[PDB]
């Protein structure tokens, strides 16, 4: 059989949400993708031997209220919290995005994975250890990625699927 998963990618403008999504959907690095386009994308993959259909909302547009975004967030099963390892403000924004998720959710137990993207860049400003502290404080996994080299991309999405499976077993 197959399982479907409704996933959401959140984070500050410019962290690589679209690049990560496109690495998962199309298996290469798209370095110019309209920063304003918010859409959902479907890809069938195989995770731990089970056919898995991932529907992924790549958040974008503006900070102003979008009902369609809200309705997708309210029903999302798992969230990638993406920052860029060369952008301290994007890391400090993670708290805000997690609070926003918890607010549109009734459950206190929402599957999430913290994702530190752009791991290929030498100009690092956020230490892996600072991100591990924050993920531990939330009780979620931390995954390092590069949408440029594809390092960690399957790890981020498939770890979120494994967290959703654990949630569904409760
Ligand atoms: C380059 C432009 C870009 O990528 N953005 C501009 C707006 C930014 C944005 N990121 C989010 O992650 C986000 C999340 C949420 C949200 C809402 O509305 C409800 C529950 C949980 C949430 F995370 N709202 C807005 C935004 C905006 C991305
Ligand atoms: N070096 C590097 N650049 C990246 C990576 N991910 C995204 N980018 C670049 O970062 C910028 C923002 O990426 P984008 O996918 O538009 O971010 P979004 O606003 O979160 O959708 C673009 O110039 C991308 O080419 C990455 O892992 N490494
Ligand atoms: Mg984008």
UniProtKB/Swiss-Prot annotation:
Q: Result of mutating residue 14 to R?
A: In pylocytic astrocytoma; somatic mutation; increase activation of the Ras pathway
Keyword presence, Membrane:
yes
Q: Glycosylated residues?
A: 36
Lineage: superkingdom: Eukaryota
Briefly describe activity regulation. Answer: Alternates between an inactive form bound to GDP and an active form bound to GTP. Activated by a guanine nucleotide-exchange factor (GEF) and inactivated by a GTPase-activating protein (GAP). Interaction with SOS1 promotes exchange of bound GDP to GTP.
Gene3D superfamilies in the record: P-loop containing nucleotide triphosphate hydrolases
Give me the residues that bind GTP, please: 11-19, 30-36, 60-61, 117-120
On this chain, the residues bearing N6-acetyllysine are: 105
Q: List the GO biological process terms.
A: actin cytoskeleton organization; cardiac muscle cell proliferation; cytokine-mediated signaling pathway; epithelial tube branching involved in lung morphogenesis; female pregnancy; forebrain astrocyte development; gene expression; glial cell proliferation
**Impact of mutating residue 62 to R?**
In a colorectal cancer sample; somatic mutation; promotes interaction with SHOC2 and PP1C
Q: What does this protein do?
A: Ras proteins bind GDP/GTP and possess intrinsic GTPase activity. Plays an important role in the regulation of cell proliferation. Plays a role in promoting oncogenic events by inducing transcriptional silencing of tumor suppressor genes (TSGs) in colorectal cancer (CRC) cells in a ZNF304-dependent manner.
Quaternary structure and interacting proteins, as annotated: Interacts with PHLPP. Interacts (active GTP-bound form preferentially) with RGS14. Interacts (when farnesylated) with PDE6D; this promotes dissociation from the cell membrane. Interacts with SOS1. Interacts (when farnesylated) with GPR31. Interacts with RAP1GDS1. Interacts (active GTP-bound form) with both SHOC2 and PP1c (all isoforms) to form a tertiary complex; SHOC2 and PP1c preferably bind M-Ras/MRAS, but they also bind K-Ras/KRAS, N-Ras/NRAS and H-Ras/HRAS. Interacts (GTP-bound form) with MAPKAP1/SIN1; inhibiting K-Ras/KRAS activity.
Q: What is this protein called?
A: GTPase KRas
The organism is Homo sapiens (Human)
The UniProt gene name for this protein comes to KRAS
């Amino acid at each position: 059989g197959m399982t479907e998963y409704k996933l959401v990618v959140v984070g500050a403008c410019g962290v690589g949400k679209s690049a990560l999504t496109i690495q998962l959907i199309q298996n290469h690095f798209v370095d110019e993708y309209d920063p304003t386009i918010e859409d959902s994308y479907r890809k069938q993959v195989v995770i731990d031997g089970e056919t898995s259909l991932l529907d992924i909302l790549d958040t974008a547009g503006q900070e102003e209220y979008s009902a369609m975004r809200d309705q997708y967030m309210r029903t999302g099963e798992g969230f990638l919290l993406v920052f860029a390892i060369n952008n301290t403000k994007s890391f400090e924004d993670i708290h805000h995005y997690r609070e926003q998720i918890k607010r549109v959710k009734d459950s206190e137990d929402v599957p999430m994975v913290l994702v530190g993207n752009k791991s290929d860049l030498p100009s690092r400003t956020v230490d892996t250890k600072q991100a591990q502290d924050l993920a531990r404080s939330y009780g979620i996994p931390f995954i390092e990625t590069s949408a440029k080299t594809r390092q960690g991309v399957d790890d981020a999405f498939y770890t979120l699927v494994r967290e959703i499976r654990k949630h569904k077993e409760k």
